[PDB]
C-alpha cells in the first residue's frame, strides 16, 4: 500500500516463531523500543498489528 492509503492488518491466533524471521531478506532490522528481539519467543500478546 501507499503511505496515505496504508492497509490495516491484524494478526489472529498464532504460535509465532521469530527465529526463522530475522534472517529473511525483508526482516533484517529491529531498531525500535518497548520490545526485545531475544524475548519475543517467550511473550504473549492480545493482538498483533
Amino acid at each position: 500500500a501507499s503511505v496515505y492509503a496504508w492497509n490495516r492488518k491484524r494478526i489472529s491466533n498464532c504460535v509465532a516463531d521469530y527465529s526463522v524471521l530475522y534472517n529473511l531478506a525483508p526482516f533484517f532490522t529491529f531498531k525500535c523500543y518497548g520490545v526485545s528481539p531475544t524475548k519475543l519467543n517467550d511473550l504473549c500478546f492480545t493482538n498483533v498489528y
Binding site: 530475522y22 534472517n23 533484517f28 532490522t29 529491529f30 531498531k31 531475544t38
Partner: protein
Amino acid sequence: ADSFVIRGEVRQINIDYNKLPDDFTGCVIAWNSNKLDSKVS
C-alpha cells in the same frame, strides 16, 4: 582488540550467534568492509 565482520547486526554490535553486548565496557571502532574486503558485492 578483536577482528570480526558482521552483516550490515550493526544495531547490536542475531549477533546469540557468537555474546558481546552493549553494556560490555569498551569502545567500538568500525567501518565498512565494502571498499577493501569486497568485490562487485
